[PDB]
Structure formats: structure tokens, C-alpha cells
Amino acid sequence: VFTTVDNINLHTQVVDMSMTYGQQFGPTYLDGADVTKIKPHNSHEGKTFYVLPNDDTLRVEAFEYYHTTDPSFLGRYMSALNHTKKWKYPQVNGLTSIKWADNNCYLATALLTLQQIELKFNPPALQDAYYRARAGEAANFCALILAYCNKTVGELGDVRETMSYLFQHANLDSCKRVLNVVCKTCGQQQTTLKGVEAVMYMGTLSYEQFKKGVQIPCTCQATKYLVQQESPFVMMSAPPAQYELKHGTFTCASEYTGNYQCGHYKHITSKETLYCIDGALLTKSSEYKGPITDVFYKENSYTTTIK
Ligand SMILES: Cc1ccc(OCCN(C)C)cc1C(=O)N[C@H](C)c1cc(-c2cnn(C)c2)cc(-c2cnn(C3CC3)c2)c1
Ligand SMILES: [Cl-]
Ligand SMILES: [Cl-]
Ligand SMILES: [Cl-]
Ligand SMILES: [Zn+2]
Ligand SMILES: [Zn+2]
Ligand SMILES: [Zn+2]
Ligand SMILES: [Zn+2]
Ligand SMILES: [Zn+2]
Ligand SMILES: [Zn+2]
Numbered sequence: 086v087f088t089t090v091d092n093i094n095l096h097t098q099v100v101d102m103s104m105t106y107g108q109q110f111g112p113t114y115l116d117g118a119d120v121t122k123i124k125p126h127n128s129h130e131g132k133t134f135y136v137l138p139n140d141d142t143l144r145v146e147a148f149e150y151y152h153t154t155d156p157s158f159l160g161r162y163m164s165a166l167n168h169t170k171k172w173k174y175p176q177v178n179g180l181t182s183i184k185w186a187d188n189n190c191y192l193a194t195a196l197l198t199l200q201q202i203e204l205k206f207n208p209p210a211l212q213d214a215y216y217r218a219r220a221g222e223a224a225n226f227c228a229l230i231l232a233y234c235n236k237t238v239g240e241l242g243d244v245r246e247t248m249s250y251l252f253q254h255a256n257l258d259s260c261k262r263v264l265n266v267v268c269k270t271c272g273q274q275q276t277t278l279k280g281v282e283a284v285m286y287m288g289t290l291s292y293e294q295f296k297k298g299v300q301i302p303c304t305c306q307a308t309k310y311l312v313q314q315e316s317p318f319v320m321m322s323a324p325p326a327q328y329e330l331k332h333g334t335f336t337c338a339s340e341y342t343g344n345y346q347c348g349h350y351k352h353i354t355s356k357e358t359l360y361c362i363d364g365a366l367l368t369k370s371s372e373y374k375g376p377i378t379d380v381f382y383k384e385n386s387y388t389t390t391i392k
Contacts, residue, residue, distance in 0.1 A: 091150035117167035166228035191242035203317035268307035339379035
């Protein structure tokens with residue numbers, strides 16, 4: 086049979102039916118199923134298996150593909166995959182979504198959002214599954230998202246927190262945000278965020294209000310406005326509150342209805358008209374009013390007019 090850690094480079098192996106897979110190769114998986122406590126059967130022979138890194142060759146290959154050295158990672162990825170490959174991934178409005186199952190509402194919103202923002206993942210495993218998710222087979226991608234976020238199937242997820250962990254494994258080095266804070270006593274302070282901090286802001290949903298200026302506390306209340314922003318997109322987050330989404334003013338948004346952590350997530354996207362994707366369900370409207378917590382805007386470069 087074949088054992089591998091990345092499903093790219095296959096290592097050939099010969100097995101004995103008297104000793105279980107766990108005796109010969111350590112923890113072994115087969116399509117998410119755990120064959121560690123299962124003896125070798127005749128149905129599968131010469132097939133590819135997932136094994137934990139036990140030698141340095143596998144340890145290196147495991148980093149080249151996943152960019153992590155945590156031994157628990159492979160197990161968590163394999164256990165999430167066993168759920169995600171049973172999920173259904175319908176095509177809603179040309180985007181790949183997830184039919185509701187196991188509190189995946191936050192996963193569906195993130196998946197729909199990722200198909201609409203420009204993002205390059207550093208781990209080859211993330212990028213390869215990202216591509217195959219856009220094609221309609223997002224099982225391995227959703228499993229990887231869970232493993233990289235230290236979350237399990239069924240656990241409650243925050244879309245803003247999920248996007249953050251994904252952005253830290255994405256190439257956002259070219260992104261830059263220049264801010265200026267104006268306290269009357271203190272004066273003017275210029276800070277320059279880069280990477281994940283250049284893309285996300287918590288406090289307001291309106292990108293315009295961020296450009297105008299947000300009232301922030303200072304070491305002395307001051308005002309923080311956006312000076313220059315170079316990034317393929319920006320994420321504006323805020324606690325869930327009623328908001329009016331206008332057609333053409335944003336890319337996509339996260340609607341959150343319910344109590345803290347217990348609530349359910351919906352995805353609103355701005356196409357030729359406002360669409361609302363709740364798993365496999367699609368509703369159309371010209372205007373939208375509802376409780377929004379994240380809004381994704383498209384950007385390329387920007388420099389403020391006030392100096
Ligand atoms: C689903 C889910 C899953 C997991 C989860 O984990 C949170 C804990 N993490 C550290 C692991 C949160 C959520 C969740 O409800 N998110 C929505 C978006 C949420 C809702 C509410 C809220 C308040 N009252 N009502 C009825 C609703 C408040 C905030 C919030 C306000 N301020 N902020 C941040 C600090 C600045 C976040 C966020
Ligand atoms: Cl890394
Ligand atoms: Cl990374
Ligand atoms: Cl609603
Ligand atoms: Zn090899
Ligand atoms: Zn990396
Ligand atoms: Zn399940
Ligand atoms: Zn399941
Ligand atoms: Zn001050
Ligand atoms: Zn839900």
C-alpha cells in the first residue's frame with residue numbers, strides 16, 4: 086500500500102494482515118476513517134493512506150504542505166474531514182455554499198466570502214483546497230479551515246475570528262494601512278499597520294465612516310481616520326446591529342441573528358441585486374435591512390484628501 090502525509094508524494098509500503106495498521110505505521114487514516122484500530126483487509130490493497138509523521142522525511146513533507154509541525158494537526162484535520170465529506174455543497178448564485186449541518190452557518194458565510202475576496206494562502210494544502218472549493222468540492226477546504234482554527238465540527242464559530250486565522254496564513258505582506266490619531270492635547274500620531282491588521286477593523290461597518298474618522302480613546306477621546314490603504318480588500322466588523330445594505334456599495338456581508346455564540350449566520354452579497362445565501366437557500370431583494378456584523382469592501386489603493 087501507499088502511505089503519505091500530503092497526498093502528493095506517495096511512499097510505498099508492504100503490510101501484514103496479522104498486525105493492525107496502528108502496529109506497523111502508527112496512527113493511520115483512510116479517507117478520514119481511522120484504520121489505527123482496524124487490521125488490514127483485502128478490499129484495500131495498494132491504496133493511499135494518511136499517516137502521522139514518524140520520520141524526518143515525513144516530518145519535512147508535512148511542513149512543506151501544511152506549514153505546521155503540531156502532531157495533533159493531522160488527526161484533527163482527518164476527524165473534521167470525516168464530517169465535511171458527508172456535507173452537501175450546492176452551487177448558489179455561482180458560488181459554492183454548504184447545506185446546513187453541524188452548526189456550519191459560520192463556515193458557509195466564510196466560504197462564500199472567500200470566493201469573493203482576493204486571497205493567496207501560504208500553506209500549499211490551503212491553496213490547493215481553496216482552488217478545488219471554488220470548483221465545488223470544498224470538503225477538504227472546510228476540514229482544513231477547522232484544523233487551522235483549532236475548532237471542531239459542531240463547535241460555534243465567529244466569522245470575524247475565522248477570517249482572521251485564515252488571513253494569518255495568507256500572503257497579506259503587501260497590504261498596508263496608514264492611520265492618524267488626532268487628540269487636541271496630544272496632537273497628531275501616525276501609525277502604519279501591515280499585514281492582517283491592515284485589512285481588519287473592529288468598531289464600525291461603514292468603510293466611509295472609517296475614512297471620515299472614528300472616535301477612539303487616547304492616552305489623554307481622539308479621532309482615528311484612514312490616511313492610506315493599499316490592500317485588495319478591507320474587512321469592517323462591528324457587534325451585531327441593525328444596518329441598511331445598499332446595492333453596489335459593498336462586496337458581501339455577514340448577518341447575525343440570535344444570542345451571543347448561539348445565533349445563526351447568513352451571507353449577503355451584492356451582485357446585480359442584493360442576494361442572501363443561507364446554506365442552500367437563496368432570497369433576492371433590492372434593499373436589505375438587518376443585523377450585520379461584518380462587511381467586506383473592495384479596494385486597490387487609496388489616499389485621503391485631508392492632510
Ligand atoms: C457565533 C459566535 C461563535 C463564537 C464566538 O466566540 C466569541 C469568543 N471568542 C473570543 C472565541 C462568538 C460568536 C458570536 O456571537 N459572534 C457575533 C458576531 C457577536 C455577537 C455579539 C452579541 C451581543 N449580544 N448579542 C445578542 C450578540 C457580540 C459580538 C461582539 C462584541 N464585541 N466583540 C469583540 C470583542 C470586540 C464581539 C459578536
Ligand atoms: Cl509558516
Ligand atoms: Cl502560513
Ligand atoms: Cl433575516
Ligand atoms: Zn517522500
Ligand atoms: Zn506558512
Ligand atoms: Zn457531522
Ligand atoms: Zn458526521
Ligand atoms: Zn490625547
Ligand atoms: Zn448556525
